[PDB]
Amino acid sequence: MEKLEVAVEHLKEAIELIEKGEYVKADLILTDILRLLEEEGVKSLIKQAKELHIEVFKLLKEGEYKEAKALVEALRVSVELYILIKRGVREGRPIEEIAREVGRKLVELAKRLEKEGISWEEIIELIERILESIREILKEEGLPESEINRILAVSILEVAKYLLEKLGFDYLVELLDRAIEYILKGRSELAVHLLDDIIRRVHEEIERYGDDVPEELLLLDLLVQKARDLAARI
């Protein structure tokens, strides 16, 4: 799969070019990356690359350098995640470590985007787009719905855990590791009950905050709720 590694290197080159200030070369590199991905033949990556070309051209016209860099980084993370999923499935790796790797990659991307200056709503939306791409890729590999839902729930819960650590709620963090371990080991109903208790605690914290609720708490609430829904659907 060296074509996809070449695509990843190109994407890094495109990020560096946008940083330098050459936007024509960045647009041409995006076209080259689209050609490479179409040569490989992954549909989700292909549509993401085409929309990336169009939207990055528009943003570079307007002057939104950070948004274009974020979109390129999101596509890069998506391609690397597809590579790692294929390597894990071929090598017969356990679903557990694949899910942990996906969560780690998503958290690293979120930390990068937070360092750049992108707001957390945009970060969450980019992460969910990547998660939908991951869902399609996993469904392509013939995996059943249970493991797909498990991986997605674990990744969402890892992002939520990073948010909780930022907020400073250590006990909820510990309960989150417990729930993640239960999801990974296959014990679904216990994890769902744990997630219900976590949701109640989060709502109590939000109600305590009152009118000055930080946006991270609301995003964490939404993330934990959708992770609980996925764990129920397992």
Residues lying near a copy of itself in the complex (CB under 8 A): 1-3, 6, 9-10, 13, 17, 24-25, 27-29, 31-32, 35, 39, 50, 54, 57-58, 61, 87, 90-92, 125, 128, 171, 178, 185, 187, 189-190, 193-194, 197, 206, 211, 218, 221-222, 225-226, 229
Is 229 among the residues that bind Zn ion (CB under 5 A)? Answer: no
Query: Shortest approach of a copy of itself to residue 20 CB, angstroms?
Result: 11
Choose between 58 and 104: whose C-beta lies nearer to Zn ion.
58
Q: Using the rule CB under 5 A, give the single segment among 29-37, 43-51, 96-104, 156-164 that binds Zn ion.
A: 29-37
Is 116 among the residues that bind Zn ion (CB under 5 A)? Answer: no
Binds 9: which of Zn ion, a copy of itself, none (CB < 5-8 Å by kind) = a copy of itself
Is 136 among the residues that bind Zn ion (CB under 5 A)? Answer: no
HEC letters along the chain: CHHHHHHHHHHHHHHHHHHHCCHHHHHHHHHHHHHHHHHHCCHHHHHHHHHHHHHHHHHHHHCCHHHHHHHHHHHHHHHHHHHHHHHHHHCCCCHHHHHHHHHHHHHHHHHHHHHHCCCHHHHHHHHHHHHHHHHHHHHHCCCCHHHHHHHHHHHHHHHHHHHHHHHCCHHHHHHHHHHHHHHHHCCHHHHHHHHHHHHHHHHHHHHHHCCCCCHHHHHHHHHHHHHHHHHHHC
